[PDB]
Design a protein around this ligand. Structure first.
Ligand SMILES: C[C@]12CCC(=O)C=C1CC[C@@H]1[C@@H]2CC[C@]2(C)C(=O)CC[C@@H]12
Ligand SMILES: C[C@]12CCC(=O)C=C1CC[C@@H]1[C@@H]2CC[C@]2(C)C(=O)CC[C@@H]12
Lengths: 221, 221
């Protein structure tokens, strides 16, 4: 038909969780890579960015900005946001938990090199001492395979995405957390998620020196 | 039903947008004020707080934490989150912009004395040239009295709530936005809002030296 169109640079950044979520719902999409500050300026000058920033997603006849606005729409549309307002409330509480950790991780590669040790240390402590216990507690409490309502929701996808990033930063962090380890395998084995994990998918690589410099120019810092 | 129960200290912080939104929907609520570090850790130890943080609200048999999850639940329950998925996307996009500036203002009194003049200046520039233009544009484009679907939603409440704080910080910032000026008066004259704006309501004051030191000891900074 008309595929969702993703407006971002060729990095993870704030678009990566939208990619995951779209792939987990079986949704094929297109990416229009911003390659320069001039490209970003175009979308601004045209009036397509309500707050002058990307991510912007063209979907279902709307140009959506703001990551949470985009992710909420996809999750509602593709039934990954709970069956009722009470499940939705548990989903929202958990994913906001996930985003707390998610944001520290996203910001890490853009931090000054004379800060990166302490920031990762802060991710280490929060992850082991607080956030991983919270999610393990949830799974232990119901003994079910999904976070909410005994059914795949966005929270499983958001948490597993995050597990792959935690995995890369410090592989020991998940070690004392068995149900988290098992959630990760089971979700990785879902057909849609299995496909996105394959080489050549729109799953993006971690930041490196070259993209960091690309980003400096595009986003002007 | 029960009265919803709000756990927080007697300050605005992250609970204040939840008080506004409950008041606007005409919901009576109870506040159990945290007055020490000990009241807060008791909450933690009793397992009331998923991520060991407030705001927390007891509502409909849940101990909901994370400001966005509480807000989304209340808004959906009281029909303030739009009529359908597409009106929800518009609302989500709007409120996240409103929260981007909202966050600047919320964090402001907690910044170091020597940062505060630059922090304010950034709030003034972003207000004048990015956020107020954005919502003045919305109103001009549809010609209606409300931001979304010609009907009161949470976006009206959160924005007007925000216009009150911008007035505290700099009364001139709104002077060039006649449609924003008019929205505030309409919304403020609404009977739930008018009541919550009266003396002795649950509405909270600006931070002062004393609530700042209270917060240092409760939240520990
Ligand atoms: C604002 C910011 C954080 C504070 C800082 O120190 C430097 C930057 C500049 C790059 C921003 C980043 C935040 C996250 C952004 C938006 C992305 O996901 C792509 C580029 C990146
Ligand atoms: C983290 C923080 C900002 C960064 C900073 O400079 C100092 C603090 C300490 C208190 C936090 C605040 C964020 C907003 C919080 C959660 C409230 O609404 C009440 C207490 C307060």
């Amino acid at each position: 038909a008309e595929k969702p169109k993703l407006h971002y640079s060729n990095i993870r950044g704030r678009m990566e969780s939208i990619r995951w979520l779209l792939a987990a719902a079986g949704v094929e999409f297109e990416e229009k890579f911003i390659k320069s500050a001039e490209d970003l300026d175009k979308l601004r000058n045209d009036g397509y960015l309500m707050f002058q920033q990307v991510p912007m997603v063209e979907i279902d006849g709307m140009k959506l900005v703001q990551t949470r606005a985009i992710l909420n729409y996809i999750a509602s549309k593709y039934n990954l946001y709970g069956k009722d307002i009470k499940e939705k409330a548990l989903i929202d509480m958990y994913i906001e938990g996930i985003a707390d950790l998610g944001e520290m991780i996203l910001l890490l590669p853009f931090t000054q090199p004379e800060e990166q040790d302490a920031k990762l240390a802060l991710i280490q402590e929060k992850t082991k001492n607080r956030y991983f216990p919270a999610f393990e507690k949830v799974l232990k409490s119901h003994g079910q395979d999904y976070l909410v309502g005994n059914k795949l929701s966005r929270a499983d996808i958001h948490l597993v995405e995050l597990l792959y990033y935690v995995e890369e930063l410090d592989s020991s962090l998940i070690s004392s957390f068995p149900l988290l380890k098992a959630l990760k395998t089971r979700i990785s084995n879902l057909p849609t998620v299995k496909k996105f994990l394959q080489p050549g998918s729109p799953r993006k690589p971690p930041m490196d020196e070259k993209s960091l410099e690309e980003s400096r120019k595009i986003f002007r810092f």
